[PDB]
Structures are given as C-alpha cells and as structure tokens.
Design an enzyme around this catalytic site. Structure first.
Site, PDB file in Angstrom:
ATOM      1  N   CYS A 108       0.797  -1.243   0.000  1.00 51.69           N
ATOM      2  CA  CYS A 108       0.000   0.000   0.000  1.00 51.69           C
ATOM      3  C   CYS A 108       0.823   1.284   0.000  1.00 51.69           C
ATOM      4  CB  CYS A 108      -0.976   0.018   1.193  1.00 51.69           C
ATOM      5  SG  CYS A 108      -1.984   1.504   1.277  1.00 51.69           S
ATOM      6  N   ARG A 111       0.007   4.585   2.840  1.00 51.54           N
ATOM      7  CA  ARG A 111       0.158   4.376   4.285  1.00 51.54           C
ATOM      8  C   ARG A 111       0.541   5.594   5.141  1.00 51.54           C
ATOM      9  NH1 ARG A 111       3.890  -0.759   4.734  1.00 51.54           N
ATOM     10  NH2 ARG A 111       4.432  -0.129   2.602  1.00 51.54           N
ATOM     11  N   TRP A 280      -9.300   6.777  -0.545  1.00 52.45           N
ATOM     12  CA  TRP A 280      -9.612   7.511  -1.767  1.00 52.45           C
ATOM     13  C   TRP A 280      -8.664   7.033  -2.863  1.00 52.45           C
ATOM     14  CZ3 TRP A 280      -8.232  10.183   2.748  1.00 52.45           C
ATOM     15  CH2 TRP A 280      -6.893  10.558   2.839  1.00 52.45           C
ATOM     16  N   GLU A 285      -5.082   4.215 -10.706  1.00 54.99           N
ATOM     17  CA  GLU A 285      -5.914   3.032 -10.491  1.00 54.99           C
ATOM     18  C   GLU A 285      -7.043   2.966 -11.527  1.00 54.99           C
ATOM     19  OE1 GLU A 285      -6.616   1.804  -6.263  1.00 54.99           O
ATOM     20  OE2 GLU A 285      -6.006   3.893  -5.886  1.00 54.99           O
TER      21      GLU A 285
END
Ligand code: HEM
Ligand code: HEM
Ligand code: SKO
Ligand code: SKO
Ligand code: H4B
Ligand code: H4B
Ligand code: ZN
Lengths: 411, 407
Positions: A108, A111, A280, A285
């Site tokens: 991720c 973070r 969000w 992506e």
C-alpha cells in the site's frame, strides 16, 4: 542483525531492524525469489502465543508494558481461551489492531495516512440486513459529500469456520460485467463471474455499461442475501478532459469511493473475515488499470483514434500518448467535482517521506516494490529508485478464497 | 517443487522445473524478500567444470559418451596439474551464449543464440586490447545495422594478472562539475571523467564528449586510447512534430556496450568481456535523459511545450516524457540505426519466455528489471508472473578496479 536500503537517486541509506520482528513467511528462498507472484480454524495451542504477542505490542505502544493492567489482561485472555477456545478484543485493542494492519500492508502506497482511520465496530451484527445497514452508514460516512475519509467496518470474527460473516463483493461499489453470446463484454469484464452470481440469486440487471452491482451479504454462515445500495449514497464522477471536448462523449464515468471488501483481517490470531475498508483513489488506479488494461474497459484505441494519432507503428507511442491524456482527464474530472483524489507523483513522494519517518521512529517499513511503483511513468517517481525490503508483520490483511467456492449452501 | 507462473492478462499458465538446476543464492530468505535490492581453489574448481561440461555435452546429445568422459578426465588432469584449465573454442562460445541466456534481468534475450563471440584470449597488452575493441565496435555497429557481440580477454589466474576495462561502457559521455555546482555532461561519470583527466586526458569540457578507453592488461597500469570518431556512430535527436526540439542540442550513441561485468564459465573468471547489442528506446529517453541524477531535461522540455507546470496533477512530466521518447525512436529510425521500442521488446520477451518454457523448462526473470520504466502496465510483461533464480554460466558484477588496483 541490520539491513540497509539505498535510494539510488539521493544516496540516502536507511537501516532496518524491524524485519527482526517478522513472523509470517514471504514465499521466497535462498534459491528463488517469488517477488512478482500475485497470490503466493485455529487450535487452543496456536492461539495463546499469538494473543500474547499482540498484547505485548499493544501495551508497549501505550507505554504500559509490564504493568498490572498488562499482566491482568494477559491472564484474562488466557483464561478465556482455555474456557471458550477463543477470546474477545477490547475496543481499544481492535482500533489499534486495524490501524496496524493497514500500517503493515507492504503493497500500500497510501500508508502515510495509517493513523487516521475511522474504525466502526460491527461485532454485534447478526443478520445480513444488519450488515447492509452498517455498510450503508460506512459508505455515507466515508464519502462525506466528496471530502473522503478513510474507514473500516468490522464484523464478528470467525469461530468454527462454519458461521463466517462474508461480503461476497470484491469492492462495496463496482460495475457489472455481462458476457454476450457473440463473445464480447458489456460493462466491466473483471466482474462477469460475480455479476452472473447476482443474476442467478435474483438480481434484475439493467444491462448497461456502468451498472452499480448489488451487495451480496452473508451473515453467520447463512446463505447470502441481495441488497441494493441507495443510489443517493453512491457518488459518481463523469469523465471529461480539460482541453478535448469530444472526451465527454466517450460516455465514461467512475465511482468516487474505493472500498475493498473481500480481505481477511488478522489480529492477535483472531480472524475477521468481513472487514470492508475504504480510502480515496490514486488516479492511475482508474485511468491506467480500470480503463486501459486489455482485460478491462480497454479504451486506448477509441481514445487514440479520436486524437488522430499514427496507430500503424507501435513506435509512434500512440498507446503511451493516449494513456497520459486519459489520466489527465480522470484527475481533472475528480478535482472539478471536488472528489478526493491523489496523482501518482504526489502519492509516491508522500510515501518516501512516510517510509523515511518509519525507519526512524519504528526501525523499518515493509514495502513491496512490484506493487508500490505506479503502472505508468515508473522511473519519474521517487519510489522507482528506492530499494525496499519486503516482509510480513501482524496485525495484517490477508487474501481468502472466494466464498462461492467454499460456501455450504443451505437452500 | 514444480512451480507455476500465471499471466494475469491471458490466463496462460506455465510450469517451471529449470529452477531446480540453480546453484547460486538470491539474497532472499523465507522471512525477507530482497527483490528490489540492486546489488548482491583446485578443489572448488573441478565440480564447476564438471557441472559445466555435463550441460555442454548434454546440449550436443553426447551425454554419457566417450568424448564426454575423455574431456572430463583431461580437464581434471589439467586442474590437478595447472591449478586451472582452458576452454575449447566450442565450449567458450556455448558458455558466452548461455551467460546471456541466463541473464534474468535482460529483456532482449530472444536473440541469445545469435551472438558473435570474439576470442581474444591471445591478447597480452593494452594496445592489443584496444585493437580487439576497435574491431568489436566496428563489427557490432555495422554502419547502423547492429549485431550482437562479445569479446573475451584472458581469464583470471591469480588475481594479480587481471584484464579489466575500466569504463562501464565502451562508449559514454563525460561528466564535469562546474563552478555553479551544477553539472555539464553526464553526472553518472563524473568520478570516471576525472580519473581520465587525472591520467592525462585533455577534455573538451563539452556536454557530449566521448570518453577515452582506460585499458588494463595483465594487471598493469591502465592506458588511455581515443576510439576513432569514425567508429562511434551517433544520432542527433529531433522530434517529428516539434521543430524546436532539435535546438535542444541532444544526441546519443548507437552502440550500447557494457564492459565492466565478470563472465563466469565452468568456474573460470573472465574479468574483461565487453558485450554489446542495440538499445531499447526507453533506456535513452526515460532513464538517460529524464532521470534526476542524469541529464534531467524534463523541466526544459516542458517549458518549450508551454505546459502547466504549476501542479503535478496536470501530468506535465508524463506528457513530456512521452514526447522525448517519441523523438529518440524517430531519430534512430530516421538515421537507420537499430532500435526497439518497449512495446515491441516486451512482446518479444513474452514469446521468448514461452519458447524457453517448452524447450528448457523455464526462464529466470527479474520483474523489477524486465518491466520498462514508462507505461509499465500497457506492456504484456507487467501482467506476467516471473521466477527469479541464478543459473551458470553467468554475468556478475565485480568491484570497480580503481579501489583494488595497486599501481
Ligand atoms: C487513503 C488512501 C489510499 C490509497 C491512495 C491507497 C492506495 C493503494 C494502492 C494503489 C494499492 C495497490 C492495489 C492495486 O493497484 O490494485 C493499495 C494496496 C493496498 N491497500 Fe491501500 N490505499 C489507501 C487506503 C487504504 C486503507 C484505508 C487500507 C486499509 C485500512 C488500505 C490497505 C491496503 C492493502 C491491505 C493493500 C494490499 C492489497 C493486496 O495485497 O492485494 N489502503 N493501496
Ligand atoms: C540485443 C539487444 C539487447 C537489448 C534490447 C537488451 C536490453 C536490456 C535492458 C533494457 C536491460 C536493463 C538494464 C538497464 O536498464 O540498465 C538489460 C540488462 C542486461 N543485459 Fe541485455 N540487452 C540486449 C543485449 C544483451 C547482450 C548481447 C547481452 C550479453 C551478451 C546482455 C546482457 C545483459 C545483462 C547481463 C543484463 C543485466 C545486468 C545487470 O544485472 O545489471 N544484453 N538488457
Ligand atoms: C488483488 N488486489 C486487488 C484487490 N484488493 C485485495 C485490493 C486491496 C487493497 C487495495 C486495492 C486497490 C483499491 C483501493 C482500495 C482502497 C481502500 C484505496 C485505494 N486507493 N484503492 N485492492
Ligand atoms: C546497474 N547496471 C547497469 C549497467 N550494467 C551493468 C548493464 C548491464 C547490461 C545491460 C545494461 C544496459 C545497457 C545495455 C547493454 C546492452 C548490451 C544492450 C542494451 N540494450 N542496453 N547495463
Ligand atoms: C531500487 C531499484 O532496484 C532500482 O531503482 C532499479 C529498479 N528497476 C530497474 N530496472 C532497470 N531495467 N534498470 C534499472 O537500473 C533499474 N533500477
Ligand atoms: C504479475 C504481477 O505481480 C502482477 O501483474 C502485479 C504487478 N504489480 C501490480 N501493482 C499494483 N499496484 N497492482 C497490481 O494489480 C499489480 N499486479
Ligand atoms: Zn524475493
């Protein structure tokens, strides 16, 4: 032992000690690296050390290690395990656990935000209708009219593995996909199998290109039930381009709230099989993966035609050119409608700072380069040049098998 | 023990057994993955020779033959006596092609069997090395129709008689630190550009000065030679739509030729083994031109394009990146110098992987290096699971010689 990582652009060298507290396996050996492989009931015996380790962690973080409160809690959990073969987390422990699972998530890039996570305790839930209500509240809170807020909702932990709570959707909000008799696909190809299940379970599909899927919710190991999320709770964004006026006529849009609902949350040996979480979006992506993967909406061509690019030789980089314009559009659209989003430059820059901060305050930051590096423009982001160590800490988020493959049907 | 790799775009699943033949270490453990880290006797020598000879003789369908056993004893006796041994030309060629074949980070391996091997094991002086290198450069360049090649100098003996090429590549641009504190030329080579001056090289102190060769034969002190400019093919960089681009003053060389690696075959060590192929466009346009610790021209180009450079979210860096890369490809193609784009090169590597899986049982690959530094997920290799492991013969890194060499 000590391990060094070097940023080959700044020559900054960091030292990792945190990997010493690593428990789980990686998949790699001295003879093979499995770094690019995507996917590589507990007894009384195994449970107490897992609980003790977590409570040691927890009590350390609150500077009460070795205290009477610490010792009493260990004794109480111990008794509860030997008497009931499991145990219940205090609220404070659950919140700490969920934040640390995110903090430990090595794939991720988001973070830096880990300590700001709104935790919704749904452990008193008993039915699918109750799950729906909790999930509706989660979506409303998290969306916040466009000003997005990270959140997680936690349903009851696993017991005998036969009364699991599961959200059958991979994300709370996602578009249907339909396979046509001619072999083509209407909507999101990634969601065809799940769409099929929904239809069989009684869903009336409008059969458009962007139909929001219903929730398929399983409580206490019972057969899953269909629920429709109130449309007024689903924030969506029409995609247009700041300079290209024909782009709106492509008919594209996307939802604002990315909310993963098929992972398993592990805290002190307890397993939470339904724990939807949301943050969000990073622009790529949607713009790179959702729209431009060959196996998804795949609009590179149609966009490329409309820009009148030389599409004869790949060395014109027409694919690369269209890809950028699309990602500009996605970012422009969200910002204009005031829906929270972050570009990949900003996100990766923030992640480097987070990682440095974590090496200093924690002694390390587990990170998976293969996933951290963005899927476009890799080397012009600072993460590309950063060496990263990958290892597993608990609490953690894990994959679990898709429920339709494991579920025992009641009928 | 048998491993499968999935392509997540096409659902093609391949099964790997070749990794079982691995001997060297990865750096990873069950507790930690080091996939993104850039860097890692008589009695030791005979099993290595044996291991190598076994695969050599297996490749020519003469495993368990008299000729096999004969060579095995001969090499054994040679080691027992000389504390080393010499490769036959055939084995030397096999070993070099397989070192390339085994290079897990190389996307261009589909060409592995078409490598021209130049045996330079009779070389004794730096002038001799220079001559071999000029011939390599001219052969590989081929007026722009590039051909893969490697030139192999004498193998290591006692570590005191080492042959080394001090340059990282046969052809590279100089780098100088200027009063401003900025940098003219290539920042990557400042340290070497100064070891050239500190050895006698008179620098034009320009932006794109071809560095001189620094050649070390038989352990002796390194010597300077300029490659005949007529042997160095270069490409002026222009854009096929931006007429202002040519005035940026950019050029690059046609021949990528790596000279600082160690080639290991059958236990033997070749410390000087420069090799060359042809570029993938992104190496130049993305890395060389746009990296922040290199030529770093993104800002200047963006300006010329009059892009909104106020906020990162306009993706102005990305837009310019694409254009710079369009220009590199256009320029090489126009001047008829071999180049491949990242789309073509990755498509080829996928076909190669699949060929290697069915004819060899697998293909070691390093995803972190195979995936190009722009537009990663619109290339097929992004969705391809890969297994990384070390096979021999191999190319390895080795220390920079100026930290080890005793003058
Ligand atoms: C708030 C902004 C966030 C951003 C920008 C972000 C970004 C990302 C991205 C881009 C990925 C790669 C996954 C993919 O490409 O499919 C990822 C993975 C992941 N994220 Fe975050 N995320 C955010 C919030 C969160 C939150 C709130 C959680 C949990 C509480 C979380 C947990 C994870 C986990 C566990 C993974 C790994 C998934 C896997 O192993 O497949 N993230 N994140
Ligand atoms: C013929 C066309 C070739 C192409 C297009 C090509 C492409 C590449 C690229 C893009 C890399 C990544 C390295 C970087 O980004 O700095 C690489 C690595 C590498 N290549 Fe190839 N290459 C070619 C020929 C060769 C040849 C002829 C050899 C040896 C005989 C070779 C051996 C290697 C090795 C050993 C590496 C990894 C070195 C390391 O670990 O740093 N390549 N190649
Ligand atoms: C296999 N991975 C894809 C689905 N999974 C498990 C997953 C897990 C975490 C994050 C993602 C990407 C979607 C996402 C979720 C969240 C919460 C934020 C964000 N920016 N993007 N996906
Ligand atoms: C960090 N390592 C980069 C320099 N090294 C050792 C290296 C080794 C092999 C290949 C490269 C990239 C340069 C290159 C060489 C060759 C022969 C072909 C090509 N397209 N590009 N570089
Ligand atoms: C830290 C990381 O290992 C480093 O930046 C790597 C990443 N991938 C790469 N990939 C290629 N092809 N070449 C490189 O130099 C690098 N650098
Ligand atoms: C095979 C490979 O590991 C797989 O395609 C990975 C690569 N990196 C990724 N990185 C992110 N962020 N998301 C992904 O889905 C993937 N897919
Ligand atoms: Zn590994």
């Amino acid at each position: 032992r000590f391990l060094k990582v070097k940023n080959w652009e700044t020559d900054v060298v960091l030292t990792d000690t945190l990997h010493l507290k690593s428990t789980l396996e990686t998949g790699c050996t001295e003879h093979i690296c499995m770094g690019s492989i995507m996917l590589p009931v507990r007894t009384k015996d195994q449970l107490f050390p897992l609980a003790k380790e977590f409570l040691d962690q927890y009590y350390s973080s609150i500077k009460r290690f070795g205290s009477k409160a610490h010792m009493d809690r260990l004794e109480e959990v111990n008794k509860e395990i030997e008497s009931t073969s499991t145990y219940q987390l205090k609220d404070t422990e659950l919140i700490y656990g969920a934040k640390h699972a995110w903090r430990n998530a090595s794939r991720c890039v988001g973070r830096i935000q880990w300590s700001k996570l709104q935790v919704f305790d749904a452990r008193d839930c008993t039915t699918a209708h109750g799950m729906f209500n909790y999930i509706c509240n989660h979506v409303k809170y998290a969306t916040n009219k466009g000003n997005l807020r990270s959140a997680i909702t936690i349903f009851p932990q696993r017991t005998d593995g036969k009364h699991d709570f599961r959200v059958w959707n991979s994300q709370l909000i996602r578009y249907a996909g339909y396979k046509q008799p001619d072999g083509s696909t209407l909507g999101d190809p990634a969601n065809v199998q799940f769409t099929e299940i929904c239809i069989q379970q009684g869903w009336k599909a409008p059969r458009g290109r962007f139909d929001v899927l219903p929730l398929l919710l399983q409580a206490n190991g019972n057969d899953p039930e269909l629920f429709q999320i109130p449309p007024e709770l689903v924030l969506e964004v029409p995609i247009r381009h700041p300079k290209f006026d024909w782009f709106k006529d492509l008919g594209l849009k996307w939802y604002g709230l990315p909310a993963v609902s098929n992972m398993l949350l592990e805290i002190g040996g307890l397993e939470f099989s339904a724990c939807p979480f949301s943050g969000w979006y990073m622009g790529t992506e949607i713009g790179v993966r959702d729209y431009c993967d060959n196996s998804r909406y795949n609009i590179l061509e149609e966009v490329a035609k409309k820009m009148d690019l030389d599409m004869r030789k790949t060395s014109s980089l027409w694919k690369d050119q269209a890809l950028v314009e699309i990602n500009i559009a996605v970012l422009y659209s969200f910002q204009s409608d005031k829906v929270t989003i972050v570009d990949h430059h900003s996100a990766t820059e923030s992640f480097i700072k987070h990682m440095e901060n974590e090496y200093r305050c924690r002694g390390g930051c587990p990170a998976d380069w293969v996933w951290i590096v963005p899927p476009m423009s890799g080397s012009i982001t600072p993460v590309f040049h950063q060496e990263m160590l990958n290892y597993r800490l608990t609490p953690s988020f894990e994959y679990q098998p898709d429920p339709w493959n494991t579920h025992v049907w009641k009928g």
